[PDB]
Amino acid sequence: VEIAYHKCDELITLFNKGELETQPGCNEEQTLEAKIGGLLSKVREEVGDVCINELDNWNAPLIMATCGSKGSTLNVSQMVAVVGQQIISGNRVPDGFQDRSLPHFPKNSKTPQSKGFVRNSFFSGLSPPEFLFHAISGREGLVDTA
Amino acid sequence: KEAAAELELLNADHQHILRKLKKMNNKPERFMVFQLPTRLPAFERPALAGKVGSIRVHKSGKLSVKIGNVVMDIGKGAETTFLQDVIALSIADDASSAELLGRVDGKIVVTPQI
Amino acid sequence: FLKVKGLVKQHLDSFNYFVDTDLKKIIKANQLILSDVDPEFYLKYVDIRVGKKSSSSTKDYLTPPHECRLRDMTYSAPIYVDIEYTRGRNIIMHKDVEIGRMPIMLRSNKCILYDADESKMAKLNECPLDPGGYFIVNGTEKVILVQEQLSKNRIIVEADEKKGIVQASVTSSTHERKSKTYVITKNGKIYLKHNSIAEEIPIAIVLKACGILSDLEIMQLVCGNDSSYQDIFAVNLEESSKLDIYTQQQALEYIGAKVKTMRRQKLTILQEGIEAIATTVIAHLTVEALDFREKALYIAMMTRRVVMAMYNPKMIDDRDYVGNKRLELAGQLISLLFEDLFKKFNNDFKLSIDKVLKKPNRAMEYDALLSINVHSNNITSGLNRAISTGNWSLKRFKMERAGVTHVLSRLSYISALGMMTRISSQFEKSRKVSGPRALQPSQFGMLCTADTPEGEACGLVKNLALMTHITTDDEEEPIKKLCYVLGVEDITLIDSASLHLNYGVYLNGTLIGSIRFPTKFVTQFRHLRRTGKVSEFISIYSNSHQMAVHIATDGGRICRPLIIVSDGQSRVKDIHLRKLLDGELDFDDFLKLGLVEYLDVNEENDSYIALYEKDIVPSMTHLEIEPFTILGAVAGLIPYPHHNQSPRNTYQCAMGKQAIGAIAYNQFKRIDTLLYLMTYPQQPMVKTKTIELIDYDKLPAGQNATVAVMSYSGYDIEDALVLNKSSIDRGFGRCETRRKTTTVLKRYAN
Amino acid sequence: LGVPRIKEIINASKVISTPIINAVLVNDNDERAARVVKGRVEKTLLSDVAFYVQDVYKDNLSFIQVRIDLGTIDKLQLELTIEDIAVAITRASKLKIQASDVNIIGKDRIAINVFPEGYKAKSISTSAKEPSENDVFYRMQQLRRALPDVVVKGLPDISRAVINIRDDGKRELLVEGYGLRDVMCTDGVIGSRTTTNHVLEVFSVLGIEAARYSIIREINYTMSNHGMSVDPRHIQLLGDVMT
Amino acid sequence: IEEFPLKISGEEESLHVFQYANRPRLVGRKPAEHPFISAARYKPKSHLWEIDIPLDEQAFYNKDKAESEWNGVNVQTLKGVGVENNGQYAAFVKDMQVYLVPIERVAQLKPFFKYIDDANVTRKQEDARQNRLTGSLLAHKVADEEANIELTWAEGTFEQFKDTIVKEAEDK
Amino acid sequence: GGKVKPIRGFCQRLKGKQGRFRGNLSGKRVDFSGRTVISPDPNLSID
Amino acid sequence: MLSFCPSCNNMLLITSGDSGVYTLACRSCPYEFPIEGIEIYDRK
Amino acid sequence: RQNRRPELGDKFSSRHGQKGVCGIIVKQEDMPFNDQGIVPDIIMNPHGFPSRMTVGKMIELISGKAGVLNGTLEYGTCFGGSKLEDMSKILVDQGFNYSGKDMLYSGITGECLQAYIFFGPIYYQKLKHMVLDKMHARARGPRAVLTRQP
DNA sequence: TTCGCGAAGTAACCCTTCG
DNA sequence: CGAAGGGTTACTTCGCGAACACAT
Ligand SMILES: [Zn+2]
């Protein structure tokens, strides 16, 4: 996980003191989210593949995922390997405060784990800004019922 | 970042009252505006008009304005105005008269230290 | 913190400050009354008190609230007024006069449950573990749900893409609102749309009717120097060079022929420099002389941000950020209705003098009022119908409001603490858009992230956290006096075009100074707060999108506490932690030494807050005390919530206040209309470290069960657990539903 | 693609968010194949074309001079010339802005702006009190700022346009606009395979029979992407209860 | 290092410093500025000053003679109400002891006009031939009543210098 | 400000969500019915 | 134009010269300006 | 007042957002027993665990089982409490499994179950909404005054 | 305190003809 | 050829809905 973390850290380093080559989109600060969200989404899929490649025989969350009793294979890797990238409203978590989401992170920080990337499991336990980032995305789907 | 550039701006605009102080060695009609609240006794209270002084310069460029009681009442560097024409008058009547004093140059703060 | 705060203080301290200060402040402005016929007989309301009778200690209101619950009788202590009229020999005579009834909520300063422990609660037949904080009128017990609003004396710059971008500013004149807006049409034309004026007024004449007519500094007062605002604002000065070029003899005449309030009185007052009310009713800044340069420049700063939010990406203030939201407590909500009912008592007392004054034989014997008993019935029938019915709607302060006082929910112990500590829902009803309904990152220390009423009212109402403090009021004269000492420069001597020197400064939505050496002003003034001088509210934060720095002082917003870090360490100082649990140096002796201060929402965006001690860097400004304080009273029942996923924690908060339990100690000496009991309650095996603070282990709401997670018998396919016969047979989870079917018997007219 | 799209097709409303227009190309080369077709549909103003809108002055009430960069026309292929920008001020914007007839002096001196004696004292029969003062502010300063706004080239109902890439070998542009009758009129795209959203303009240019086939396709597109199989015999009836 | 002296004097001065919002700073980046011209007027305690200056060298005002309706202009007027602050002073230096004299009522000024303003109220007679007290409109009522003190200056240089140097000569 | 418009006649008792076409002709309350909480039982036949 | 008058502090404007003088003239702030005049501004 | 027995139709909680009605009631010579004779009080279905992702209940059982065997009540607070690492050391000290899964027998046939059963103490609540109050029926009763409806 | 289209209601303007 | 009448399109205002059903 530190490989993609260092990749996202180095890609912001080329973004602050310099400038990146853009995509056929709007501009920069819009193609940044498409490259930092399209990169962190591969980490969860890779670890979900290599978790079910590793996971032991004769256990019930794999049998319920093999059948489809109640659950899936992204579901079983989310409580074992890692949770990841709580999307709200299509994009990442926006800033609640001025230029930052929480006061526990420095200003104008677009690094992962600051704009929202839960790098733990449900078995491992969450950090408090990580718990807030999970609790925001658990509301916007819950409010879709009402 | 803000404290370092703050003290460098204070260093860059700290010579300006020392520039103005040796400016105008002769005495025509000029003025400049000082501001200081919180009247101190500074040795005792004889009666508003209290004895005060000591607005000197410490070495390596440090304007050590202080009220003589206890306090290093230190601080200068007020805002530079953009309007130009400004003039002091006096309308204490004394059988209906008026005056025209000194075409005042500028304004600088005197801030207490906490 | 909870030893002197106690998690129910927003209702207690507000009511105590009401009966301490505002109950005297209302009669400070409503004590002059006379009559046209016989211009003698003046009334003078002198010092008022809530149930004291100053030549005694305590009387009359010896009764407990439990006697006022089984009898269907209100709980109240009578209020007393001394009056100093003149009847025959113009000598001001002293006499104690009871005028009203005024129900007092439980566990207040003027209550009997104050300072009771282990012997007086049992004798007066009441559980010593209930939170209190509620009223009891007509037998039933009722709370006042705390309402939130938007910030009153501010500027909201909420925009729109299809329609032109909007900017508004509400206000308040001591009980009303008088809001104002303006929409923009014709590719940029700033107007002043107000409901008390006809159609549309351009910006170029409002600054000339109120303030500057130079038309040179105006292209720097609202434009800046050079950047992009010149061509944006240049279309607004074409209206002044076409219709109206000079001062009051055309400027106020353009407004006065268009404005209308007209009172059905004071008609021919038009229009030249007289009837200048329409240039003083467009804010709350009341002026007397020709000193409105601060008010004119405040109008000019109201129309500067609408220019700034055209070239800039979004640059808007949203109605979701909880730094833009204040909240009105129970005392602040009962104060306006007591003021309106006292003023209805005032003018109806005028009508009862001349009706019986028309010369029967004389006017110089009796006690000069003699007709207060029906008026004393009228003054208490409004307080007992504003709390019981819930309609606080009066036609003076321009608001109708229903559904603010609810009956206290008594199902378990935590349902009484869920009715307590519960902020309500204001406007922006939000049918389809989930703007004011979704969860925001700004509510970290306050406004608990999981406790939400799942259903049709989800997202609108929410609940506070543990370390939350809400202020009431703070004075304004020794703060504007202190800013002049610290080095601001008032508008009356820096009126030049040198006014936008990169930052500026203004006080609570009123522009006073213009500072140079900015961080010398912020750090030195914040040191005044941390040393024992003026403190407890003062929000100090500078901005970067806008440029000013705010010294906000009007109370009514949230003040969670945090611990300071030093340059390279913290102000923890472990000897103080050892001295804390020794017996001395409580939380009141803990702010005076400069270790903690109450931070805010709109202030903590200028703060870099650390979580733990093992990750400190010298860029921090504060540290947080305990990170589990976001989950409130009801949300704290969940064991290990950071292992569950967020819909599971919300669904329990609507269910912990729903299970049966062990409600109170006087559980069998009360005749509630419906309450559920439980025969053998058991403590939870996994005690959360916050359910020991709120005393959930004293009165629990369930039983431990030796569960076995296995697929068995087929009767548990979809969410339906199977139980043991021989365990219910031995008393697993026995219930007792208890109901009241009371009737009254009364005498008739004959 | 969710519930507002099906609400809009059921409601058959008159306005629409993101009405993309798919119009297949003829060639597939790099230059002058997918660049000029996008180069005459992209809705360029004169703000990215002309340098400055300087008002040079003779003794009383001169014109508005505008300096048009031909190098931008050399970079991005547009077929506008010294006459094409001259025609588009007068007749293409006649009820919006008013300019009867002038000429160019020579070497990029486009000056189609005139205020002749204040419209001859604002229709010489004196409608107003010394009519409009003959100031150079009420119509001339208005035209000073209302003309980084006129259309020099493009189709007047289109927001923007960009090029997507075909799955195997080619590329394919798509247009966000309205009307559809002048998009297929453009050379380089053919009107035989030009499809779009907003059924009510397909009814406006093709008929009632080619509009129901756009009903049973856009519902089939907005719901089969969600993994819903709705057995299209059901939806061919819904496309014929309003046809 | 430098023991600058510093004393407070001044009792009967009550000096009123103005602020002209008309002339800019560093015209052509040259320190050579501030001319002003002759006599003015004054009005009692609502203050609303009436400082005014006449015209100067040629500007060709012959087409729009003179103010609005051919009234023969010779002066440009301005008014300003003098609401008072506290804290500041007025002060100057004897290459030593600054003087720091008091600063009684001080505010800025706004360019009030002559019969340009009076033309609309003159046309009304040319062609067409609760509590009414303190709180909202008394400032616009007791401000247009009588005239008073006003007089030209004399450039008092030596007398005020003596009055500031004699009274403070007791501390040392 | 007496009540919620204080007057109902012949259209307010016919406007939807409480009216006749909406709440008395199309959707109406019918006897010979009853509702109770559901619970699982696999030993029934599926009909 | 965004041009302002000196020494009398209002907004300049250009009116008809009545075919006797070829210049601008202003309301409440008279001023004289010759026939030469430019306005350099770039609209991107 | 009346005494209400827990019977078929009453709902229960788990302090973790797990509603559920009573499936059936069933005897003690049924539900399976361990080596010491413990039969369970309530049997839950494991299918409510994956899609609800509520593994905090799955830490609650092993933290409450070691809390009885040690005697002291243990903590389950946010972002801390009692760690799982020094939790299951109490389990292996007492003589139980590391994971809290002991082999059960069967009450209906005697032979041991094919899998390992995750059983232990979990605090359950009893809600409102009993089926005695939700039960409702009508054949032919009074009608409305205006519209003659039921 | 909110988006959706469809009714009237009113103005700018162009075609057509009259003596 | 200038002026008067008939008629097309364009700018601005109101009202009707907002899910089922239980206990209050
Ligand atoms: Zn002027």
XYZ file of all heavy atoms in Angstrom, chain G residues 5-6 8-11 27-29, ligand 1:
67
model
N -12.373 62.902 -13.377
C -11.977 64.304 -13.409
C -11.036 64.637 -12.254
O -11.184 64.097 -11.154
C -13.202 65.210 -13.341
S -14.195 65.009 -11.860
N -10.050 65.498 -12.491
C -9.206 65.983 -11.398
C -9.802 67.208 -10.726
O -10.579 67.961 -11.315
C -7.894 66.336 -12.112
C -8.328 66.731 -13.478
C -9.507 65.861 -13.811
N -12.107 68.022 -8.817
C -13.514 68.157 -8.466
C -14.232 66.828 -8.280
O -15.400 66.845 -7.878
C -14.241 69.019 -9.508
S -14.016 68.508 -11.219
N -13.579 65.694 -8.566
C -13.870 64.373 -7.996
C -15.276 63.873 -8.355
O -16.164 63.755 -7.510
C -13.658 64.413 -6.476
C -13.545 63.033 -5.857
O -13.634 62.019 -6.541
N -13.333 62.995 -4.545
N -15.457 63.602 -9.643
C -16.659 62.925 -10.133
C -16.247 62.119 -11.367
O -15.058 61.859 -11.579
C -17.780 63.952 -10.383
C -19.167 63.329 -10.356
O -19.312 62.121 -10.168
N -20.191 64.154 -10.538
N -17.219 61.704 -12.178
C -16.953 60.912 -13.373
C -17.046 61.768 -14.631
O -18.042 62.462 -14.851
C -17.928 59.738 -13.480
C -17.662 58.830 -14.671
S -18.748 57.393 -14.737
C -18.204 56.628 -16.262
N -21.270 66.845 -16.677
C -22.267 67.317 -15.727
C -21.639 67.477 -14.348
O -20.985 66.557 -13.848
C -23.441 66.341 -15.666
C -24.530 66.727 -14.679
C -25.257 67.989 -15.112
N -26.332 68.343 -14.189
C -26.168 69.094 -13.105
N -24.971 69.580 -12.807
N -27.202 69.365 -12.320
N -21.804 68.669 -13.766
C -21.398 69.055 -12.412
C -19.885 69.041 -12.189
O -19.438 69.205 -11.047
C -22.089 68.194 -11.342
O -21.628 68.523 -10.045
N -19.082 68.878 -13.245
C -17.626 68.837 -13.147
C -16.971 69.199 -14.481
O -16.499 68.310 -15.201
C -17.176 67.457 -12.642
S -17.797 65.988 -13.521
Zn -16.065 66.270 -10.701
